[PDB]
Amino acid sequence: PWPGVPMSFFSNLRAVNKLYPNQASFITDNTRLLTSTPAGFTNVLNAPSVRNIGNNRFQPGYQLSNNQFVSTSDINRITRNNDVPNIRGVFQGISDPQINSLSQLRRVDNVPDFNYHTKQTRSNAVKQNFPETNVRTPEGVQNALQQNPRLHSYMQSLKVGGTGILLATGGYFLFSAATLVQDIINAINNTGGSYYVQGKDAGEIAEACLLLQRTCRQDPVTICPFDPLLPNNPPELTNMCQGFNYEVEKTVCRGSDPSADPDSPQYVDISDLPAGQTLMCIEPYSFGDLVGDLGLDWLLGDEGL
């Protein structure tokens, strides 16, 4: 908080994205959040509450009018993402002008998450509508290109051009291998893990790097020069991946998901990070994940999605 300056809406949302020792400490922070809340969001945020999740640990949230509980983590997620369907589903009766009033706030605070949500939802629809793209093998990729020849001719023309393409991970889709298929395999095998993401230029640009010690599974790219929450290799960080069970946890990351269950090893408290920065887990790309990151989904089938 800058001295004499009220905190921005998304800074206040970030400040309450944590666990609390009791309910009163959260009402206090929430009262401050309400002094920064635009017009269509107050009905929900004026209804704060907490659930007791063992020990002296309280998860903060809001009781919806349908008598459902939504945590500050979920509020942070849908608003930072500009997840319009979920914003409408939670902040009921909100108008489109009110929804779009978050746009300027996201821009000034350099909130990057919205574009990752746009890529991921595109990627989900790609893998749902064109399941031959949900593959990570050389033969799977080649069959995927076989079934979508428009995408194949486009990408082969990208290879002839030779210009590498920046991916959402901060790594690159390069074109120097002997076949396009191999370029694709090289690209997607260099994705997956815990990413530190910072918006710049009013959110137009994102800079992302990989956090090695929160990446518990990595198959054989920009590495973060430091961990932003645990400096100087404490045992809490160096041992974070002990007992990691991919079958059970079903993610390559630990301590990189602010929206995960607070009792799971996926959870992380980022309430100290400024509003334009976040941690996230990006699972290893399928070919469809690469197509969705690049916005090449209109080349699938005869007319795309």
Give SS3 for 295.
Answer: coil
Query: What gap in Å lies between CA 119 and CA 289, rounded to an integer?
Result: 8
Residues 6+ apart with CB under 8 A from 189: 136, 219, 220, 284
Residues 6+ apart with CB under 8 A from 266: 249, 251, 253, 254, 255, 256, 257, 260, 281
Closest by CA to 254, choosing from 166, 303, 189, 193, is 193
In which residue are the tokens 């903060």 written? 60
With contact defined as beta carbons under 8 Å apart, do 194 and 255 qualify?
Answer: yes
Give SS3 for 51.
Answer: strand
With contact defined as beta carbons under 8 Å apart, do 258 and 3 qualify?
Answer: no
How does DSSP classify residue 294? H
In which residue are the tokens 């991919």 written? 246
Give SS3 for 200.
Answer: strand
Query: What gap in Å lies between CA 217 and CA 237, rounded to an integer?
Result: 15
How does DSSP classify residue 252? S
With contact defined as beta carbons under 8 Å apart, do 276 and 90 qualify?
Answer: no
Show the CA angle centred on residue 14, arms to residues 8 and 19, nearest 5°.
Answer: 140
Beta bridge partners of 69: 63
Show the CA angle centred on residue 161, arms to residues 158 and 166, nearest 5°.
Answer: 60
Question: Which helix (H) or strand (E) element contains residue 197?
Answer: strand 193-200
Closest by CA to 136, choosing from 295, 288, 293, 304, is 288
Query: What gap in Å lies between CA 254 and CA 212, rounded to an integer?
Result: 11
Closest by CA to 289, choosing from 156, 182, 168, 114, is 168
With contact defined as beta carbons under 8 Å apart, do 214 and 223 qualify?
Answer: no
Q: Which CA distances in Å does 138 have to 135, 171, 173?
A: 9, 20, 16
Q: Which two tokens stand for residue 81?
A: 């993402």
Closest by CA to 109, choosing from 278, 225, 228, is 278
> Within 13 A of 122's CA, how many CA atoms are on the CB side?
20
Residues 6+ apart with CB under 8 A from 3: none
Q: Which two tokens stand for residue 32?
A: 């401050």
Task: Give the start-to-end residue ranges of the domains of the chain.
Answer: 9-108, 113-190+286-299, 193-282
For residue 24, the one-letter residue type is: A
In which residue are the tokens 């959260």 written? 26
For the chain, give the number of residues: 305
What is the resolution in angstroms? 2.2
Closest by CA to 212, choosing from 203, 201, 225, 199, is 225
- The DSSP bridge pattern shows strands 58-63 and 48-52 to be antiparallel
